[PDB]
Structures are given as structure tokens and as C-alpha cells.
Write a protein that binds this DNA or RNA. Structure first.
Ligand SMILES: [Ca+2]
Length: 341
DNA sequence: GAAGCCGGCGG
DNA sequence: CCGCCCGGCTTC
């Protein structure tokens, strides 16, 4: 298995700088607002230089960067920018998995006919192409599975090319900090250190069960496989980006004859923004009181709009027995788990 | 089942 | 830092 993982450096920042080149060499800050207060989406080199970073409240960011340019975020254009890039990658890969707007996994095992060095060069070729074609720097990871490829990518930022070779893989498994693992955050590392575990290997000397009592099987076991180099878990042809449209109603209601004519339209601005076939739909409804009542059914394959309008209709109506007192302010749909062709 | 907590992650 | 968040595990 050869996976190249692609990560877009400070994408939103980069897109803006590409669109408005006079922003370059000068602090730029992309901002995000609630339903209110605003925070930093991303920030460019110079903004980051001064200490800005995601989540930072815009007041705070101004405290340390008054010379900065604060723009509102434009998801759609960054999405158009993302999709162009995902397509480039697509041509390069046997299977592509679009993890997010700025992340994709690529199985290329076949493309380079199993040759890991040609894997790395393909990975070089990809970096150079995105820069040449879109003026954007990404960070690649090349490794014999998804999880490793992400890890080595994050180890290689900014504008990196990380590498774990099947032939060398065990030395990397030997020096990996437990905290550097996806799924292991601030709390879990803090607790996992307590037995004497900061390297991945450490677990193998420590008994099995107690670890679950700190992790939960599904992760405790997922650590065990990584340590042993038994995690495979293929790269699937699916997009993980959720597409979802809402529509506020003329008045709060419960009359299905009123809300269907708003459900339909919410799906059209979504089941069209599909590019594939969703294994998941979620009917989402906001009440008079801002509270949220969301139900959704999983499909073996996907679901077309062929089944959609009634999957959504009964999914609303099931929420109309689950809540019986309250009215609906706003109605939404979310399509994710998209299978690609 | 389905609310709710906990913990991780990214706009 | 917290969400038309998220999933996973616990609990009525
Ligand atoms: Ca990112």
C-alpha cells in the first residue's frame, strides 16, 4: 500500500493571497463569525509571525496585529479552489479520499506499480504541480497507510514532504510520541503518560485491558494495531465534506404541508452540490427556541434524490413524533458520506 | 432509542 | 477558543 496524503497549508490565507496579491508580504487574517463574536479562521505568514492563530478572538488578534488586514471568510470561493485541486489529485490516484476541504488521501500503489521511491517522486510531482498550477503550497506525506501518511505530513509542515518507508517503518514506530497520534489529544496523552507511555512501543509491555479503561476499545485496539504495524484500512473513493442547506420559514409551524415546500428546496441546493452519492442524510430542524432536532438514516450504498424526497419526509415526520409540543423555526438537510466515481 | 457526557479537533 | 460540530461510549 502506498498512500500520499495532501494537506493544504493555511488554505484560506493562501487563497486570499492568490486572489488579492497585494495582500502578500503583509499580515492577513481570515475571520469567522457565529450565529455574535468573531474568531480567526486562519492567518498568513506575517500575521502568524506576530503570533495570531485559529480560534483566537478577533479582539485578541488585533491586540498583537493592528497593522493586519481582517477579511471575512468566503467558503464558496475556497470551495471552488479546493475542488479544482482535488480534481488534479484525482487524475494522479487510483483512489482518492477527500478528508476535508484541505485534506485528501490518495492510494497510488498501482499508479507507481508498487515502487515506493516512485511513490515519493509522484508525491514531489504533485507538490510542484499544485504550486505551478494554482500558486498554492501543500504538504505531502508518503507512507504505507493513511494514519502514518497524515502523521508524517503534520511532522513536515510547512510546505513539507514527509516520508515513511515500508523498509524503515519500524524505526518510526519506535520513536513516535504517543501524543503525536490522531485521536490522542491534550487529555489522553496526559493520562497515558501515567503508566509510563510516551512512545508508541511502550503499550506492548503494558497489559491490554487497563488501556481500554483509558481509551475505549475502538481506539485502544486501533493503537494496538498501529504499534504492531497491522493497521491497514484502505483508501476509499468517498468525499467526507458535508453539504447542507437550510431555509428559515415564514412562521414557526408543524404543518407538514408547509414545511415540505421548504424541505424540497433545501435538498435541491444540496443533492445538486453532491458530486457523488451520499451514504448519509440528516434532516435538521431548528425550533422557536434555537434548539436542534436532527435525525438521519445510513444507506448500504448511497441514496439518490430518486429515494430522497420521501427519506427526508419520513425523517421529518419521525421528528414530528419525537417532539410533539414544539414548532419548527428553520429546516435543514445534510448530505455526507458521499461515494465518488 | 435516544439524550447526555466526554474528549478531540478545526474554523 | 466553542459549534444549524462530531462521534463514540454511558446512561435513563
Ligand atoms: Ca488544516
Amino acid at each position: 500500500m502506498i498512500v500520499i496524503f495532501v494537506d493544504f497549508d493555511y488554505f484560506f490565507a493562501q487563497v486570499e493571497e492568490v486572489l488579492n496579491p497585494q495582500y502578500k508580504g503583509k499580515p492577513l487574517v481570515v475571520c469567522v463569525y457565529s450565529g455574535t463574536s468573531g474568531a480567526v479562521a486562519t492567518a498568513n505568514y506575517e500575521a502568524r509571525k506576530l503570533g495570531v492563530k485559529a480560534g483566537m478572538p478577533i479582539i485578541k488578534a488585533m491586540q498583537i496585529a493592528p497593522s493586519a488586514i481582517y477579511v471575512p471568510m468566503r467558503k464558496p470561493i475556497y470551495e471552488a479552489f479546493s475542488n479544482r485541486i482535488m480534481n488534479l489529485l484525482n487524475k494522479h490516484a487510483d483512489k482518492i479520499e477527500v478528508a476535508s476541504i484541505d485534506e485528501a488521501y490518495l492510494d497510488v500503489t498501482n499508479k507507481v506499480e508498487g515502487n515506493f521511491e516512485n511513490g515519493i517522486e509522484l508525491a514531489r510531482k504533485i507538490k510542484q504541480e499544485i504550486l505551478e498550477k494554482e500558486k498554492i503550497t501543500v504538504t505531502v506525506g508518503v507512507a504505507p497507510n493513511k494514519i502514518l501518511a497524515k502523521i508524517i505530513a503534520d511532522k513536515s509542515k510547512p510546505n513539507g514532504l514527509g516520508v515513511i518507508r515500508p523498509t524503515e517503518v519500524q524505526d518510526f514506530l519506535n520513536e513516535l510520541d504517543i501524543d503525536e497520534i490522531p485521536g490522542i489529544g491534550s487529555v489522553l496523552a496526559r493520562r497515558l503518560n501515567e503508566l509510563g507511555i510516551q512512545k508508541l512501543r511502550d503499550i506492548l509491555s503494558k497489559n491490554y485491558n487497563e488501556l481500554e479503561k483509558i481509551t475505549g476499545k475502538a481506539k485502544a485496539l486501533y493503537l494496538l494495531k498501529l504499534a504492531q504495524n497491522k493497521y491497514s484500512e484502505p483508501v476509499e473513493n468517498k468525499s467526507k465534506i458535508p453539504h447542507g442547506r437550510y431555509l428559515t420559514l415564514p412562521y414557526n409551524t408543524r404543518d407538514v404541508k408547509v414545511i415540505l415546500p421548504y424541505l424540497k428546496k433545501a435538498i435541491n441546493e444540496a443533492y445538486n452540490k453532491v458530486n457523488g452519492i451520499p451514504m448519509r442524510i440528516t434532516v435538521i430542524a431548528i425550533m422557536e427556541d434555537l434548539d436542534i432536532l436532527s435525525k438521519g438514516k445510513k444507506f448500504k450504498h448511497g441514496i439518490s434524490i430518486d429515494n430522497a424526497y420521501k427519506v427526508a419526509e419520513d425523517l421529518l415526520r419521525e421528528l414530528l413524533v419525537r417532539d410533539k409540543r414544539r414548532n419548527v423555526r428553520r429546516i435543514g438537510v445534510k448530505l455526507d458520506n458521499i461515494i465518488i466515481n
